[PDB]
Structure formats: structure tokens, C-alpha cells
Amino acid sequence: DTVTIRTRKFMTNRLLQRKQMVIDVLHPGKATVPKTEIQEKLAKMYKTTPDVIFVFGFRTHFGGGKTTGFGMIYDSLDYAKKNEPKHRLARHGLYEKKKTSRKQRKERKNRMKKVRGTAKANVGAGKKPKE
């Protein structure tokens, strides 16, 4: 309600091929209408199919009233997927990170040490221990 995305400091990021601006939305008494709404709202502002609009920010101002977000209207998803921090991909989930998680990969580094050749045997050397 009474949202009004105020694109402060608009930056035509030509070398990252995107529309880059600060999202500043207003509220009656409940801050932060949802992010993908703001994407879809910043879509129809720019007519840009908002699944290339990879937003973040969105902290709720005290007293409702306002929320500062941030917008990157990438001019393509290739313009998105070229720049794209993975936690912006995980800001609204359409790509996520590694879930080995992190200790088996550190364990596999202990496996290539022991024999020369056949990483499959060393992947297999890390495969049998699961403790």
C-alpha cells in the first residue's frame, strides 16, 4: 500500500549492462511489502520482466512507513547471470550454493595425497568413510 518505488541514484550500469538504482518504497503503517512484489512493481515501472530484476536490501524502517531496498534491473538474464552474486541468486532463490557441506571436500583433499593417479580411487578413497 502507497508503495511508490523511489528510484534514487539511478545508474545506467553500461559495463554490467543493467539498470542500477536504490529502491525506496513507502508504507501507511506496515513497512516492507515483499521483494518480488517490488520486482513486479519495478517491472511495470520499466516493463522489464522482473525475473531479471534481482533485488535485495529491504530492511524495515521503524514506524512502518518506509523501506529502503535496492534494485538491479538487469537488461537480460544473461546480464543477470554474468554479474550475479550467488546470494542474490539466493536472495530470491533461483540458484543456490554447495551443500557437500564443506567438510567432505576438505576430506577429499586428504585423499589425493596418498597415491598418485586415479582420482576416482581417491574419490573412492573419500567415498567409503562417511563418519
Binding site: 545508474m11 550500469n13 553500461r14 559495463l15 554490467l16 542500477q20 554479474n83 550475479e84 552474486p85
Partner: protein, 263 residues
Amino acid sequence: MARGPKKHLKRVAAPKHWMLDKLTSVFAPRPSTGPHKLRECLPLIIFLRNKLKYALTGDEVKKICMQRFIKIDGKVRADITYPAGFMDVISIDKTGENFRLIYDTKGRFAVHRITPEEAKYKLCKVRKIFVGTKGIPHLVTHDARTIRYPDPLIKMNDTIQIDLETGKITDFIKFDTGNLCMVTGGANLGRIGVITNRERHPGSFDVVHVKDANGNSFATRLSNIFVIGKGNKPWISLPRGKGIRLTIAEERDKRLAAKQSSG
């Protein structure tokens, strides 16, 4: 045990003229080795995402360097932290924007769009003129660009309009009295103006008495004096903060002005 040189560099114990923050990021960009000494140097990533702010994360700036959109000294850069020193143009190859690295009299790097006429040449006050082996004279400037066959009338501290397209030096400007010199370092950083005086001592430690454009006359050594051309003859544009000298009671009259006066 200092068993080799440090291959890491953290923040705030970092140069202040890079205008980094406090411990918000616990590591520094750490510029590479190259043409200039490391404190003179400026990382691209500070100029890219902390001065122009087209990026926000480091792996983008790696890919922006994989975009190869950055030409420093007219030469293709894929370094996020290239050791670029003084009067180094930066050609942002996608926005069509040239910026030459010069210092302010406030004490900050100037995001300074020179004309592309002024981007082909940069003025390097020379570092040495040496008769190399087999009887061959040379000039090598402060960015260590070893150039065979100098000019046959130049001497020390002459400024060469370094052709950034080629190297392979173009015309010079002789080290002359009263030249415009962006005085850099100490309490005289970023000050341009005529020379009007130089003092000599055998051994070391020669001071140079410089009277700038505002009338501040000051004796500051020739190490602080980088000649940028001819007296009352600039060769790029003047940076922000007038590039000469500013007083702080006037600076509040500056800082009150364009905030809430724009848009």
C-alpha cells in the same frame, strides 16, 4: 618468522588517501607489483565499485576484468588491483569514459574525466637518462617504461608526453623554472602552480620553494614536485576541489552548497 614476503594485506593500517573505511571489510585490495611504488598505486576495484560503484562484489570485478573493459595508460587491463600511479588515464571501454588519476588538494583521488585528446599522452617527469650498453642513450620514466633513443636535448626531470597508445616517446616539455607542478605529498598535496624557486644542496635533501596559484608560497622538496607541463599551461583539466589549495572555513561554505540543491 617472515620466511617470505607477505602475500596478504588487510584494511585500516592501509593508505588513507585511498579513502577506505574502517574494519567493515577485514582485507585490503592489495595492489600488484608494477610500474609505480605501491603506495602511489590505486586498485581498480576501489575506483570501480567504491568510487564509481557499478559493481558491489569482488567476483564481479574479476569478471569485469574478464570483460576487459578497462584500459589504464591506453593498455588493456584485466587486473582488479593494477598498480597505476600518477597521471594514468583509465579508459572504461564500455561506458566510453576516460579518467586520469590525479590527486586533489583535499587529499583524495580525483574521478577526473579528461578529454580523449588528453588521454593519448600523459606527462611523465622522467626518472633517469642513461647511456646504455653499446653507447646508446635512453630515457626511462617514473613508470619504468624503458624507452630507447631519447630526445637529444632533454635532461633530468623533463616531462615526456608519454604516448599511451605506443610508448615509444613523443615530444617533451623541458624541466623549466616556473612550470605548473602538481605538488604532491605532505602538507602540500595536490597543489598546482608555478615553481618560481628551487634550492640546491650538495649531497642530498634539496628543497624547492613553490608559490602556487593561490599565493601560498612553500618550500617543499623536489620529491614532492611532479612537473605536469609548462607554467600557466595545463595539459589535462583541473581536478575537483580546484586542485590548488582550499581553506576549511570556506570548505563548510562548499559542503553546504550542492547537498539539497540538485534534482
